[PDB]
Amino acid sequence: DIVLNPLGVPSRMNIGQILETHLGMAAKGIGDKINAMLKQQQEVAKLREFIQRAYDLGADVRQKVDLSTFSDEEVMRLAENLRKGMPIATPVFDGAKEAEIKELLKLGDLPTSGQIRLYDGRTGEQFERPVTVGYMYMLKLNHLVDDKMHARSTGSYSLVTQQPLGGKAQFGGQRFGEMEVWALEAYGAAYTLQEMLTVKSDDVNGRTKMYKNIVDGNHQMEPGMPESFNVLLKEIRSLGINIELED
């Protein structure tokens, strides 16, 4: 159903994954026995015998459930309830040992190693080397790209500073921050840097001229002076300091 990359697993040293797969494999296996069994219209007695024989496997394991206590249906019920897999439950640090997993797994006529020959689907050719296949139990996290993909070209601005708005929903444009400038400077690409700073954020006359030339196929900039500098000059004039630009 779903193909995942072995190379995750050694470096990160989370081996729950692997043992999960194997015991999952072995878990489906029993339900496949029972699936196939009920699908062949077997008698209730034999089905009782294989489930009883399933539950009681393992060293110790403290769960004593046995059948013969509940009779006729009740057993057919559960068996149809576990047709889709037998739900094995391994508590936290007293959990199942490998040994018990191979044991459980031999009852399902699955290979002890938990790896199986698989075939390519395009070429039809066998992969060299066996492969671990196994049921692992996935989740889908609350991060979805429908919520993520944004994209704006030209939208609403801010009254002061006249820059685009913050975020998606409101259509941000996309902070182009100090490290990002540093990287362009480092490339020495000063035009890209110059249209970022001006024309496509705070140069108002220059954003207009820009977009009108683009619509016309000019692709030329006509850069001006960004608002936010002007503001700064007023805000420093608001202390008793003049700062003026001398030609």
């Binding site: 692997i18 790209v145 182009f176 490339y187 020495g188 690409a189």
Partner: protein, 603 residues
């Protein structure tokens, strides 16, 4: 948007989600619409792209064609952290990023997100083609060595293709061309083996501006041969004949870049990517609990150590070896136990896998999965294996001490409630370092930038004869950095002399490159006078003969580059990964060796 992988899609390209462009390119589209005559007025255009039917997608393609976009990610640490690409429209909500650049961006695919920006104008587009496209810069303008280097499953596939194996049918056939593809695809043979003798043309660059063909029959393997179809002429066969691990492949793109230049190497890379994925996938490489092999000896070493430490603690019960010294003592026991259990598991997972030609044991390197994975250089390390199979070892208490009783369990057998709870100490202590490291790192780069930005590179030559004398770094435990690595690039102040008196191998000032460094490597010269910045070549600029190699493109630095900022981000980029503060790095005991007696490695 979110990033996915790009696993076709050549280097200079970039899967851009269809829906998402169409926005980014709006102005551009309306232009085209008004040209073709599909809209007479702006409102018409506007309305048709709002209705987004039909012609518009057709025109989008025409708009995007050759218009470079630029992608950017997250903390931008160095200049590589933003790069420029030719988009290819793809239905989807996510951006496909070619693998090879994942290095630079420091991005995996666990839900990272990229910004995208559109250069407008012309100037900007050209600055994107001739500066930020990912095919200009394959080399890291700090160390100078390639980025782009294949990682992770590309490595595992090349390493699988080129191996030797004992037997593996169709061994000792002689074939020519090879091509040999015939024979792997057809069965007929096993690429890991056969140690097939195949005839091969070389095409050496021995003659200047000409490729002289040399052919011969070599002993090599099938997958070697197969892989040789990719290598673009001008290189030796000896580059592809070997186990070919990660290192090997960086070196191979390095040599390719140096020998035959940029254009055939940027293609050659691609190709490597593809054949890596290919073969690795064919190999069926997987991992399974039996792949972690705990050595039978482990029980025995741990029992011996439990007995030793019992002896010392009974000596403590008798008054001898006070807990002061007993602590360091017991540390010295369990650490040596760690090393011995480690040595046992490494000996068991390498070699073994003994195949048989008539003698029953040729004793070949193992094909164990986890072993191949670490060995290839793809993921992981020996230390990281030891956690899965041998001991975990001594645990660091959050106060910077060591607990007397180490963890004896690998992850194959689980940890004990108590031992896990102890592991926890150091886990969390170390998570919480990356926080601090981000802040302090960045503040550092901030200041470095701030100081260094005014630097420019203005005058071409200065003419100063001052410089810095350049040597190896030798210390106790031989030499870490050899003198070629230090003196490479740069330029020469005054001259150099052979070990013979009044014999010069370089005139005046010279640019020192791989050839000149071979000249200096073959002779006995242990010091070279080299001019460098900070000797203040010129006034404001730091002229290019100081300085003197741009790294990145291997020619000398051209006039008008920054240098400032490149340095700062080069210094500062690393350090994200650093020891940070508050470590003694002792490892053995607090007491010094106290031996003033010297020793020599060689004669």
């Amino acid at each position: 948007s979110v990033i996915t992988v790009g696993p076709y899609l050549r280097l200079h390209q970039c899967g851009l989600p269809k829906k998402m462009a169409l926005e980014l390119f709006k102005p551009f589209i309306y232009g085209k619409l008004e040209l073709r005559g599909l809209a007479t007025t702006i409102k018409a255009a506007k309305k048709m792209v709002e209705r987004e039917e039909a012609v518009v997608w057709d025109i989008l393609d025409e708009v995007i064609r050759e218009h470079p976009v630029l992608l950017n990610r997250a903390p931008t640490l160095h200049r590589l952290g933003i790069q420029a690409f030719e988009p290819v429209l793809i239905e989807g909500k996510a951006i496909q990023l070619h693998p090879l650049v994942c290095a630079a961006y420091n991005a995996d695919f666990d839900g990272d997100q990229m910004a995208v920006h559109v250069p407008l104008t012309l100037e900007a587009q050209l600055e994107a083609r001739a500066l930020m496209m990912s095919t200009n810069n394959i080399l890291s303008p700090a160390n100078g060595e390639p980025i782009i280097v294949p990682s992770q499953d590309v490595v595992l596939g090349l390493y699988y293709m080129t191996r030797d194996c004992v037997n593996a049918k169709g061994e000792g056939m002689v074939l020519t061309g090879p091509k040999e593809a015939e024979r792997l695809y057809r069965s007929g043979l096993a690429s890991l083996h056969a140690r097939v003798k195949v005839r091969i043309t070389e095409y050496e660059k021995d003659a200047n501006g000409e490729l002289v063909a040399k052919t011969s029959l070599k002993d090599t393997t099938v997958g070697r041969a197969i892989l040789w179809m990719i290598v673009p002429k001008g290189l030796p066969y000896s580059i592809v004949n070997q186990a070919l691990g990660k290192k090997a492949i960086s070196k191979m793109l390095n040599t390719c870049y140096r020998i035959l230049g940029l254009k055939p190497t940027v293609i050659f890379a691609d190709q490597i990517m593809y054949t890596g994925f290919a073969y690795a996938a064919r190999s069926g490489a997987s991992v399974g609990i039996d792949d972690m092999v705990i050595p039978e000896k482990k029980h025995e070493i741990i029992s011996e150590a439990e007995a030793e430490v019992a002896e010392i603690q009974e000596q403590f019960q008798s008054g001898l070896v006070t807990a002061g010294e007993r602590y360091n003592k017991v540390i010295d026991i369990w650490a040596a136990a760690n090393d011995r259990v480690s040595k046992a598991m490494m000996d068991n997972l390498q070699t073994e896998t003994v195949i048989n030609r008539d003698g029953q044991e040729e004793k070949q390197v193992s094909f164990n999965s986890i072993y191949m994975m670490a060995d290839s250089g793809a993921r992981g390390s020996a230390a990281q294996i030891r956690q899965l199979a041998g001991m975990r070892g001594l645990m660091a208490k959050p106060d910077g001490s060591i607990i007397e009783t180490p963890i004896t369990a690998n992850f194959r057998e689980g940890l004990n409630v108590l031992q896990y709870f102890i592991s926890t100490h150091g886990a969390r202590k170390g998570l919480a370092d990356t926080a601090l490291k981000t802040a302090n790192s960045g503040y550092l780069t901030r200041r470095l930038v701030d100081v260094a930005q005014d630097l420019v590179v203005t005058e071409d030559d200065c003419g100063t004869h001052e410089g810095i004398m350049m040597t190896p770094v030798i210390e106790g435990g031989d030499v870490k950095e050899p003198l070629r690595d230090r003196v490479l690039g740069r330029v020469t102040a005054e001259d150099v002399l052979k070990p013979g008196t009044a014999d010069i191998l370089v005139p005046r000032n010279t640019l020192l490159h791989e050839q000149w460094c071979d000249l200096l490597e073959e002779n006995s010269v242990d010091a070279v006078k080299v001019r460098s910045v900070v000797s203040c070549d010129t006034d404001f600029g730091v002229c290019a003969h100081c300085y003197g190699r741009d790294l990145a493109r291997g020619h000398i630095i051209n006039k008008g580059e920054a240098i400032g900022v490149i340095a700062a981000q080069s210094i500062g980029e690393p350090g994200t990964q650093l020891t940070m503060r508050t470590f003694h790095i002792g490892g053995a005991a607090s007491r010094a060796a106290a031996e003033s007696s010297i020793q020599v490695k060689n004669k």
